[PDB]
């Protein structure tokens, strides 16, 4: 038998943590309608009173109200829901004092979840921004139409970057294999002013087009081997583990 604890503002508001292996004491006086909290997204199946005529049960979704309509009603409630089954031990109090207006719950495993996940997300974001252990290759040539030439170009073994000044127009970037065909690589834009076009590969030759203006980019320090992507993400400091289970 658990007992809810009084809140620090008014004793008619009390909280108790759900516990599957114990019952919860409910102390109701006559003439008060106590409102049970049921946690968000819970699916009611059926309930069962010790005395169906002792207390008035009304449910609107996940809200449960209880009110005595019988003298000397010492009974119990067993509500089975989506996941858990709540156990109550209703007791009438004849003083008409110290009522509970509502009963709200605390769920331990849930809080163990959210508190862990917030720390995990903060750590992940910190790891991404704290990038360390990287080398950069800066040897790139152009050939062609310099009107749309980027102001800088490099790579980090995994991503190839381009930077355009404020007044230029972001062209498209095309994969060029050895034979000479052009093809598409996904691109993302990063940077404070979105002036950095980042493609997701490293290649000896890039192709830049804007309308009828063309420019070629050569990687004069192509690495056939490169660093393997063993972390499963764009950083060496973050794993990628499976929520899937199964």
């Amino acid at each position: 038998l658990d007992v809810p604890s009084s809140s620090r503002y008014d004793h008619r508001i009390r909280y108790v943590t759900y516990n599957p292996a114990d019952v919860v004491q409910v102390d109701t006086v006559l003439g008060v309608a106590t409102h049970i909290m049921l946690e968000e997204g819970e699916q009611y199946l059926t309930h069962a009173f010790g005395d169906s005529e002792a207390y008035a049960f009304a449910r609107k979704g996940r809200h449960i109200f209880i009110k005595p309509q019988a003298e000397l009603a010492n009974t119990n409630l067993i509500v089975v829901t989506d996941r858990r089954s709540y156990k109550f031990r209703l007791q009438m109090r004849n003083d008409r004092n110290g009522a509970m207006y509502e009963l709200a719950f605390r769920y331990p495993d849930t809080q163990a979840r959210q508190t862990r996940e917030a720390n995990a997300r903060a750590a992940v974001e910190a790891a991404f921004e704290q990038r360390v252990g990287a080398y950069y290759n800066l040897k790139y040539m152009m050939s062609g139409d310099k009107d749309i030439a980027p102001v800088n170009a490099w790579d980090d073994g995994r991503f190839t970057y381009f930077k355009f000044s404020a007044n230029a127009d972001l062209p498209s970037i095309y994969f060029v294999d050895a034979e000479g065909n052009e093809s598409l690589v996904p691109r993302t834009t990063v940077g404070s002013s979105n002036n950095i076009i980042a493609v997701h590969k490293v290649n000896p030759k890039w192709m830049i087009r804007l309308g009828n203006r063309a420019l070629a980019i050569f990687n004069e320090a192509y690495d056939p081997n490169g660093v393997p992507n063993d972390t499963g993400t764009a950083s060496p400091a973050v794993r990628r583990v499976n929520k899937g289970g199964n």
């Binding site: 050939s143 102001v151 950095i196 009828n212 063309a214 420019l215 070629a216």
Partner: peptide, 28 residues
């Protein structure tokens, strides 16, 4: 006796370096 025109391949003569200055974002 005709086919799709191909986009202009840039010439390969006035090849020059791209990064006249070192990029700032490199923290260098």
């Amino acid at each position: 006796c005709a086919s799709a025109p191909k986009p202009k391949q840039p010439s390969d003569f006035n090849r020059e370096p791209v990064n006249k200055t070192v990029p700032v974002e490199i923290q260098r």
